[PDB]
Design a protein around this ligand. Structure first.
Ligand SMILES: [Mg+2]
Ligand SMILES: [Mg+2]
Ligand SMILES: [Mg+2]
Ligand SMILES: [Mg+2]
Ligand SMILES: [Mg+2]
Ligand SMILES: [Mg+2]
Ligand SMILES: [Mg+2]
Ligand SMILES: [Mg+2]
Ligand SMILES: [Mg+2]
Ligand SMILES: [Mg+2]
Ligand SMILES: [Mg+2]
Ligand SMILES: [Mg+2]
Ligand SMILES: [Mg+2]
Ligand SMILES: [Mg+2]
Ligand SMILES: [Mg+2]
Ligand SMILES: [Mg+2]
Ligand SMILES: [Mg+2]
Ligand SMILES: [Mg+2]
Ligand SMILES: [Mg+2]
Ligand SMILES: [Mg+2]
Ligand SMILES: [Mg+2]
Ligand SMILES: [Mg+2]
Ligand SMILES: [Mg+2]
Ligand SMILES: [Mg+2]
Ligand SMILES: [Zn+2]
Lengths: 48, 45, 108, 152
RNA sequence: GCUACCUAAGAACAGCUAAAAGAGCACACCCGUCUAUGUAGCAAAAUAGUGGGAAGAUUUAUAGGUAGAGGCGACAAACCUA
RNA sequence: CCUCCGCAUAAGCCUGCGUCAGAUACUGACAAUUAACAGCCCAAUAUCUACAAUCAACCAACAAGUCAUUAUUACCCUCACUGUCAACCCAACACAGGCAUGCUCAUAAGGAAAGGUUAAAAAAAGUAAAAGGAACUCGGCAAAUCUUACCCC
RNA sequence: ACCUCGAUGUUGGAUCAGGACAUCCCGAUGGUGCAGCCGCUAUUAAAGGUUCGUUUGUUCAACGAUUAAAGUCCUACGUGAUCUGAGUUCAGACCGGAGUAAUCCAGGUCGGUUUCUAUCUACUUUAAUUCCUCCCUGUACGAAAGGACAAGAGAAAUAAGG
């Protein structure tokens, strides 16, 4: 009956856990991408 | 707005004040001679 | 605006040695009965507070080691137990933080 | 003119003030003892007391849960707020926080204070204690009290 | 190596409306209308907003050329290392 | 909480926050950037080379356009040299300015507007405002709205 | 042409106003070609007040509506280290005119950078006026027209302080 908020790192803070959560957000966008074209585009757009 | 009139580029540097250009004309030869007489450590650019 | 004349050293001494400028003697200093170092009456003793802070740092480092990661704050009370000490009935059901030293006399 | 203004002007604005207080209060909930500039501790003490009251309100209370969710930036502390602190102070009605001035900050000589939740597991602070009842003045006043009691 | 003009060979110009436009709205980009601040300033000409152009007579990186009785100039006696 | 950015190439600079020791993002010592990327090319003599590009297909042009070889003669027998670092350059400065290109089009990358306190004036930036709505002022400057019509050049 | 050209910044406007009285209004009084209402004039009075707008850069003036009144002046034509720059008064350019031209105009017109962190002096908390309404009163006065004072009552506006 008590809905505690999920215990996850902040998505905007400047910390290792927040960076990992942002990476997870990115990977979630990749997962949600339907077409393999979109998947590859999202996976390869950032050039480093 | 002003002050940054020096946009460095080694090609322009050497083609404008280089040893070869200075020796190209008699005036530049005399420039080098003046530097040598004064004792400059850097005759050309 | 710019100064019309140089201010003389006499005038400058007057200004900068006026008692309003001078540092005020503080009469609220007193000796700490615990350690004997000086402390301002209203302020906590620096020496004693540093003792407490260093012990707190040790305890908190043990707490962090036991937690093992971020966002792992316990949902139960905590008790610090020193060498030669065992949990009491009240301490039962409380996270035990074990410190490898004799209990400080001031700590109770 | 600031007659009756009760909130300090802190940070970069009202929102920044709220966020600074929120960070200090999250640190207080996590560590049970925080040393910070005196004015900020004074401003955050009331919010600490208010969180203790909201925790007393209980887990099921949606308003209390929303307040805790907003104020505790680290969500692992909301269970702490509702299951460790509020039960600890169920008996009490107020004064959950102890605030005491600390020697000025070495860096910028700032007025610093230490604020803690009472009854925490951490070592006790060197609290200022009143003079012993056995002092000369206190014994004389005890004589006064006894004389008055005998008279009545 | 700034700037005026030019030479060689390059590059940039989202989106929308229209349709092969020195066309319209509008990014990047170029400029600098008006205001405020600044005036030993962040700056020996800037900042914030506002604004003009933004497929062209456009903007721009690179190298080269024209030198003072001169050069270059869509003439402002402009610009030619503050 | 911010993200103008950021990461690379070019250009520029030239060791300019790597380790150690001393001082008090400095001094001295030690180390480092490894070619496939890029630069550094081409044996002669003649001789060829009308038909753009624009998804090049229709159309449509005008300003009429970056991209081609052959013939003979010589010739293989042998993967060097150089750049590779950085928080960086031009502005006397850790300068709110200047700074080409490719991707990212808001980021996975990069950052911190608050030294502490108080909350006086004056000043700067912003927000809100009773009724009125240009009466302000040189002028509707600024701000707020999105708004007609007529003149000079 | 006496100080100032090794700078005394300039006309209007904003802000704040200090002062004079030769008084525009309010007070007291004499005269009047003062019947009353408006007035005119003079003595005394500078405590207080002395409007907002349309063009125009305008100080002014004209005009509109008011007011008890919308005073004359001095203060570096007060006050730009408080502000604005519309005019004027640089560098650009057009029209008319002058000149061969450069360029110029007692001409017009469009645009055109307002610095200063205060050392010293000085300074930074010192019983209110006026209008109007009713009544007096349609009375006194006067041929009529028109039309009062004083006393009384009530209302406001500004200014000061909260
Ligand atoms: Mg250049
Ligand atoms: Mg502050
Ligand atoms: Mg386009
Ligand atoms: Mg166009
Ligand atoms: Mg001309
Ligand atoms: Mg001229
Ligand atoms: Mg900061
Ligand atoms: Mg500060
Ligand atoms: Mg309003
Ligand atoms: Mg007007
Ligand atoms: Mg209108
Ligand atoms: Mg006016
Ligand atoms: Mg405007
Ligand atoms: Mg003279
Ligand atoms: Mg004479
Ligand atoms: Mg002088
Ligand atoms: Mg008089
Ligand atoms: Mg005069
Ligand atoms: Mg002017
Ligand atoms: Mg003419
Ligand atoms: Mg003019
Ligand atoms: Mg203009
Ligand atoms: Mg000024
Ligand atoms: Mg001042
Ligand atoms: Zn002590």
């Amino acid at each position: 009956v008590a809905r505690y908020p999920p215990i996850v790192a902040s998505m905007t803070a400047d910390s290792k856990a927040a960076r990992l959560r942002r990476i997870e957000r990115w990977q979630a966008t990749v997962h949600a991408a339907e077409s393999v074209d979109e998947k590859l585009r999202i996976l390869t757009k950032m050039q480093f | 707005a002003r002050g940054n009139e020096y946009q460095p580029s080694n090609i322009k540097r050497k083609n404008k004040h280089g040893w070869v250009r200075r020796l190209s004309t008699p005036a530049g030869v005399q420039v080098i001679l003046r530097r040598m007489l004064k004792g400059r450590k850097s005759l050309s650019h | 605006a710019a100064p019309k004349n140089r201010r003389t050293i006499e005038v400058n001494r007057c200004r900068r040695r006026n008692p309003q400028k001078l540092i005020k003697v503080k009469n609220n200093i007193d000796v700490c009965p615990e350690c004997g170092h000086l402390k301002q009456k209203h302020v906590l003793c620096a020496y004693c507070y540093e003792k407490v802070c260093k012990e707190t740092a040790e305890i908190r480092r043990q707490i962090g080691k036991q937690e093992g990661g971020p966002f792992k704050a316990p949902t139960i009370e905590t008790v610090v137990l020193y060498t030669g000490e065992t949990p009491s009935e009240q301490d039962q059901g409380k996270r035990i933080i074990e410190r490898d030293r004799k209990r400080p006399s001031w700590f109770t | 003119i600031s007659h009756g203004r009760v909130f300090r002007r802190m940070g970069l604005g009202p929102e920044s003030r709220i966020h600074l207080l929120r960070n200090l209060l999250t640190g207080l909930v996590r560590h049970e003892r925080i040393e910070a500039p005196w004015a900020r501790v004074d401003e955050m003490r009331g919010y600490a007391e208010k969180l203790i009251d909201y925790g007393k309100l209980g887990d099921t209370n949606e308003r209390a849960m929303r307040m805790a969710d907003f104020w505790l930036t680290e969500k692992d502390l909301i269970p702490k707020l509702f299951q460790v602190l509020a039960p600890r102070y169920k008996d009490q009605t107020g004064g959950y926080t102890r605030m005491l001035q600390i020697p000025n900050r070495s860096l910028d000589r700032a007025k610093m204070a230490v604020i803690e939740y009472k009854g925490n597991c951490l070592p006790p602070l060197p609290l200022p204690r009143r003079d012993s009842h056995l002092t000369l003045l206190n014994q004389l006043l005890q004589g006064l009290r006894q004389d008055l009691r005998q008279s009545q």
